[PDB]
């Protein structure tokens, strides 16, 4: 599986864990 697991961090990964921090991030702001 852990080749699966390499190929998912090329699978526009790291975009997507940018815009869930930004988000999260966001989200602390808001409380
Ligand atoms: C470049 C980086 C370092 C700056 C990114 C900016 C954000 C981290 C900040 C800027 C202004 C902030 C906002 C300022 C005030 C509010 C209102 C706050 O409360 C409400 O929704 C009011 C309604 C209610 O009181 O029920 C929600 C979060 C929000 C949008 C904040 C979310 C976080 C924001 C977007
Ligand atoms: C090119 C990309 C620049 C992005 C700048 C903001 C990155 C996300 C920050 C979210 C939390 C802010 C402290």
């Not at 190929?7 to 409380?31: D, G, H, K, N, P």
């Amino acid at each position: 599986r852990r080749f699966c697991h390499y190929i998912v961090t090329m699978r526009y990964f790291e975009v997507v864990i940018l815009v869930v921090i930004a988000l999260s991030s966001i989200a602390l702001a808001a409380e």
